[PDB]
Amino acid sequence: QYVRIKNWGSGEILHDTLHHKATSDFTCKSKSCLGSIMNPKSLTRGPRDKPTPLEELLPHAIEFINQYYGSFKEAKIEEHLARLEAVTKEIETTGTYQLTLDELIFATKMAWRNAPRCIGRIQWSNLQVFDARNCSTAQEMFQHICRHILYATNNGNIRSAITVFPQRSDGKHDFRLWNSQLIRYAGYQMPDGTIRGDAATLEFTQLCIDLGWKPRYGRFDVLPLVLQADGQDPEVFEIPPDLVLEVTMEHPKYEWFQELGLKWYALPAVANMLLEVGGLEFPACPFNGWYMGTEIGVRDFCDTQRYNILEEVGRRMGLETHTLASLWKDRAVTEINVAVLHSFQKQNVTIMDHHTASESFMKHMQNEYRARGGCPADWIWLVPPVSGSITPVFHQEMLNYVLSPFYYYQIEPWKTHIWQ
Amino acid sequence: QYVRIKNWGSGEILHDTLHHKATSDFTCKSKSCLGSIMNPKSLTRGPRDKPTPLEELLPHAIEFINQYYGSFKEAKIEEHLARLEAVTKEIETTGTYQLTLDELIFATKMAWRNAPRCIGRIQWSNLQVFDARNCSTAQEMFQHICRHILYATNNGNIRSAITVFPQRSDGKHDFRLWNSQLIRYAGYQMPDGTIRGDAATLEFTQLCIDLGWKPRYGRFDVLPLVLQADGQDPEVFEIPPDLVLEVTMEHPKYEWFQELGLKWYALPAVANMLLEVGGLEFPACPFNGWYMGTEIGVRDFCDTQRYNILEEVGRRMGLETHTLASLWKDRAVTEINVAVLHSFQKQNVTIMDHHTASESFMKHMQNEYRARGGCPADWIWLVPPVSGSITPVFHQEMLNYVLSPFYYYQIEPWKTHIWQ
Ligand code: HEM
Ligand code: HEM
Ligand SMILES: C[C@H](O)[C@H](O)[C@H]1CNc2nc(N)nc(N)c2N1
Numbered sequence: 001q002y003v004r005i006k007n008w009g010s011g012e013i014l015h016d017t018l019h020h021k022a023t024s025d026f027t028c029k030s031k032s033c034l035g036s037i038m039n040p041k042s043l044t045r046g047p048r049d050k051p052t053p054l055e056e057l058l059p060h061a062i063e064f065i066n067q068y069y070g071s072f073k074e075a076k077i078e079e080h081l082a083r084l085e086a087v088t089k090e091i092e093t094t095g096t097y098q099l100t101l102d103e104l105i106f107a108t109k110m111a112w113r114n115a116p117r118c119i120g121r122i123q124w125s126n127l128q129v130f131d132a133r134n135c136s137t138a139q140e141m142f143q144h145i146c147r148h149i150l151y152a153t154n155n156g157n158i159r160s161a162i163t164v165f166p167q168r169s170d171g172k173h174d175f176r177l178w179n180s181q182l183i184r185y186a187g188y189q190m191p192d193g194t195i196r197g198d199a200a201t202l203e204f205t206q207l208c209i210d211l212g213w214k215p216r217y218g219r220f221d222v223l224p225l226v227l228q229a230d231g232q233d234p235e236v237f238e239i240p241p242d243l244v245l246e247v248t249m250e251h252p253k254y255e256w257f258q259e260l261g262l263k264w265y266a267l268p269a270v271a272n273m274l275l276e277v278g279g280l281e282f283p284a285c286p287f288n289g290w291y292m293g294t295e296i297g298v299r300d301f302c303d304t305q306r307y308n309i310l311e312e313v314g315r316r317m318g319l320e321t322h323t324l325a326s327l328w329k330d331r332a333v334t335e336i337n338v339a340v341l342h343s344f345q346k347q348n349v350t351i352m353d354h355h356t357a358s359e360s361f362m363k364h365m366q367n368e369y370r371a372r373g374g375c376p377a378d379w380i381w382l383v384p385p386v387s388g389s390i391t392p393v394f395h396q397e398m399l400n401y402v403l404s405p406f407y408y409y410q411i412e413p414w415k416t417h418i419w420q
Numbered sequence: 421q422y423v424r425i426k427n428w429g430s431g432e433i434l435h436d437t438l439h440h441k442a443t444s445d446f447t448c449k450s451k452s453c454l455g456s457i458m459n460p461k462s463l464t465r466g467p468r469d470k471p472t473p474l475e476e477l478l479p480h481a482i483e484f485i486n487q488y489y490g491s492f493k494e495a496k497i498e499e500h501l502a503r504l505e506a507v508t509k510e511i512e513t514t515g516t517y518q519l520t521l522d523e524l525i526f527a528t529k530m531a532w533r534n535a536p537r538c539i540g541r542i543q544w545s546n547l548q549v550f551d552a553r554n555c556s557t558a559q560e561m562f563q564h565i566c567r568h569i570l571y572a573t574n575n576g577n578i579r580s581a582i583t584v585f586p587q588r589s590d591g592k593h594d595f596r597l598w599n600s601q602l603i604r605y606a607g608y609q610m611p612d613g614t615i616r617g618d619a620a621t622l623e624f625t626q627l628c629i630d631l632g633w634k635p636r637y638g639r640f641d642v643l644p645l646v647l648q649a650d651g652q653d654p655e656v657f658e659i660p661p662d663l664v665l666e667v668t669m670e671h672p673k674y675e676w677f678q679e680l681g682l683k684w685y686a687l688p689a690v691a692n693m694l695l696e697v698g699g700l701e702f703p704a705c706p707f708n709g710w711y712m713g714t715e716i717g718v719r720d721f722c723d724t725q726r727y728n729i730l731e732e733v734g735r736r737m738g739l740e741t742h743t744l745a746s747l748w749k750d751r752a753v754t755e756i757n758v759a760v761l762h763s764f765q766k767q768n769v770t771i772m773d774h775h776t777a778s779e780s781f782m783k784h785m786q787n788e789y790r791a792r793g794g795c796p797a798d799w800i801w802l803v804p805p806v807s808g809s810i811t812p813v814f815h816q817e818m819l820n821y822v823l824s825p826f827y828y829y830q831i832e833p834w835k836t837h838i839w840q
């Protein structure tokens with residue numbers, strides 16, 4: 001009937017109804033749990049050769065429209081029926097159909113609302129939508145992307161926004177951003193064996209080089225936008241520095257911290273995800289919210305596969321870096337976390353600590369269960385990379401399921417592309 | 421064929437073969453992930469009215485024996501066939517069958533080896549087994565339990581051990597320990613609205629009271645062993661204080677920490693789990709390993725539903741306790757963690773920090789994949805309650821599945837019991 005869910009901190013019980021509306025198949029098998037997998041197929045929406053079969057498209061389209069129209073406080077029945085009619089008509093005449101701007105807006109928010117890996121979802125109703133569905137060239141994509149960065153940044157007072165490019169038609173005319181995120185640093189494998197910058201963007205940095213990009217060989221070199229429009233080969237565009245707002249890292253007590261020469265971009269903007277709504281798919285829809293301190297302090301700065309600054313922040317702190325039991329790592333990471341929070345705060349750049357964020361997500365869950373009987377949640381992603389059980393979300397049992405609309409992952413474009 | 425598994429820190433890839441030997445059904449559905457659930461039915465082995473049907477028992481028995489005999493470096497084929505024969509014969513003559521001591525030993529280690537929620541599994545081959553299958557009375561159970569505590573404690577130099585009581589026969593003659601763990605503190609709901617001791621053992625403390633136990637009304641009152649033998653009503657036995665070794669908490673720098681009057685028992689011994697091996701089930705088999713610092717420092721001391729000492733350790737540290745963004749909670753918990761590690765170390769009581777433990781588990785995973793093509797792992801339990809991504813296990817993708825033998829959870833006895 002429904003699944004019982006308990007919060008082991010408050011003791012509160014919730015009943016999940018929403019999981020019934022879930023998609024065909026999720027990430028887990030009957031005899032095994034695959035929730036730990038980063039990129040499961042169930043979370044990926046790949047390439048195509050032909051348009052979406054009419055028989056699959058129509059039911060999905062109708063279902064989305066009913067969801068949309070079933071939203072408003074006082075239903076616009078005539079318009080509801082009228083839209084159902086016009087959409088069917090449009091589908092049988094064009095193959096595909098176009099969403100109204102108000103439907104797109106609703107779609108992007110619901111998709112975000114349905115992101116089981118996002119902890120910022122209490123902000124779901126505050127999202128600026130940039131309609132770039134009429135875009136046709138790489139240069140036009142680039143221009144739209146610049147307006148996005150500029151708007152979202154708002155001189156540190158970050159605003160959530162998303163830019164929707166033309167929907168996938170036949171699949172051989174996809175608009176795609178080859179970057180992971182709008183703003184990201186380069187990673188180079190230097191002559192002395194080491195690695196400079198972001199070691200995660202290594203393979204992609206090479207790709208940019210091979211496409212004629214000028215490697216500035218640093219630690220924080222903002223990578224170029226690699227845009228592909230209407231299926232054509234990707235064109236390389238460098239992002240105007242005036243647009244890339246950064247925060248230089250400094251500890252509020254350790255004056256030697258700034259001597260580390262660390263900084264990070266203020267804009268977290270996912271660039272490679274696909275929006276699925278009512279049978280339609282938008283393989284290019286960069287979006288952004290604002291940063292949660294731990295993303296930078298813990299993952300970007302302390303991951304072994306990333307900047308890996310733990311050992312030296314430990315050393316400069318005077319901790320017993322060669323004795324794991326001293327819990328030096330716990331001490332360092334925390335100080336790096338406050339550096340990040342302090343730095344963003346000082347420079348007036350929006351950011352949220354993982355504790356306040358968790359609390360708000362909990363509030364969101366409560367709002368969501370009451371409002372629609374559920375909230376798809378991926379515990380493994382929602383629980384911060386540090387201070388796990390100190391957070392409320394750690395004690396909250398959750399159900400992870402794929403609804404619709406939804407933001408899917410897609411196969412890396414350079415692996416599946418035509419080179420003319 | 422097999423599932424590809426990647427470690428995002430080292431980049432290393434492993435192929436899981438073992439998941440094929442998994443049990444009928446796990447915790448997850450086809451369209452939803454239930455990995456976040458604490459007590460799923462797939463991890464629970466409940467009550468019974470009748471013995472295990474012969475047709476189910478035999479294949480399981482044979483399968484276990486083949487596993488057992490397929491273990492030895494040089495197979496004892498004659499004995500293998502001979503055991504297969506004697507076991508079948510014993511089953512068709514008695515209904516059930518008895519494991520040899522060497523098989524039990526193998527069984528307990530494999531079960532531990534198959535515990536997806538245990539991070540201490542690199543120690544799987546070092547386990548003392550106490551054969552109490554001949555036990556018949558509560559007083560005898562109590563005596564066995566005392567020998568266990570005494571042996572395991574070893575005056576601080578903790579030794580992993582397990583005590584196997586008589587296997588479930590018809591199901592109405594079960595030996596069961598009503599306690600969560602061998603040693604645990606009481607929790608009382610005091611007259612002034614507050615709660616003293618362990619708030620998690622509240623309901624159980626009442627049960628002990630209702631059974632004629634003398635409530636000492638403190639914060640660290642070692643609860644009584646509530647034993648049920650051969651299905652008879654549970655008999656209350658108080659644990660001899662000389663057996664319960666404790667560690668008083670003290671910070672190596674904050675002399676005011678001991679003023680908190682905190683301590684914890686040195687022996688983590690799970691008391692309510694069931695061992696399943698070759699179609700057989702032992703609903704009473706208390707076991708223990710040693711503590712991982714975070715269990716005490718983070719969960720026992722900082723959980724809101726437990727001792728909840730975060731706010732005051734924060735206050736005494738002088739931190740901005742009313743400003744979440746100050747990350748005071750991160751600062752406190754870490755200091756509490758070092759207090760625990762320091763205290764156990766000072767008093768010569770075995771303990772392991774979460775970092776060294778994680779590293780060893782990673783080593784175990786590697787050994788296990790090479791040795792048998794897999795390692796059932798529950799990421800949600802294996803990743804420490806603090807310093808998540810600072811740990812290696814956080815970046816390791818894992819498959820969670822139920823093998824055999826296995827340690828299952830069981831329904832709380834007071835909910836399903838006869839009262840004569
Ligand atoms: C308003 C502030 C927001 C905050 C603080 C927030 C925070 C986060 C965090 C911490 C993650 C995990 C990032 C990682 O570990 O790689 C995440 C993931 C995600 N968020 Fe949000 N978010 C916000 C806004 C948004 C918006 C506006 C959207 C979309 C319209 C969104 C969509 C998602 C999606 C789809 C993911 C999954 C990314 C992936 O799987 O790689 N978030 N968010
Ligand atoms: C040698 C040292 C060992 C260490 C450090 C270790 C550590 C741990 C930790 C941290 C947990 C999680 C506890 C919790 O969060 O409630 C756990 C769970 C578990 N361990 Fe181990 N363990 C060890 C030995 C053993 C032994 C000897 C057995 C069994 C023979 C075992 C069986 C299990 C099982 C079944 C669980 C699941 C408990 C549950 O689900 O509540 N462990 N262990
Ligand atoms: C292997 C594991 O799934 C992976 O490292 C995860 C864990 N949780 C998580 N959580 C968040 N928010 N971002 C991530 N990148 C990850 N990655």
Ligand SMILES: C[C@H](O)[C@H](O)[C@H]1CNc2nc(N)nc(N)c2N1
Nearest residue numbers: 394395396397456457458800801
């Ligand atoms: C709700 C959630 O599953 C629960 O709080 C979990 C998370 N992980 C975890 N991990 C460990 N080692 N012990 C626990 N008690 C829990 N409990």
Ligand SMILES: N=C(NO)NCCC[C@H](N)C(=O)O
Nearest residue numbers: 268288289290291292295296
């Ligand atoms: N807050 C968000 N989304 O809104 N972050 C997106 C991923 C950013 C990435 N984790 C980083 O820290 O670089």
Ligand SMILES: N=C(NO)NCCC[C@H](N)C(=O)O
Nearest residue numbers: 688708709710711712715716
């Ligand atoms: N280390 C183990 N098992 O071996 N712990 C078992 C659970 C103990 C419980 N987590 C506590 O801290 O009280």
Ligand SMILES: [Zn+2]
Nearest residue numbers: 028033448453
């Ligand atoms: Zn699952």
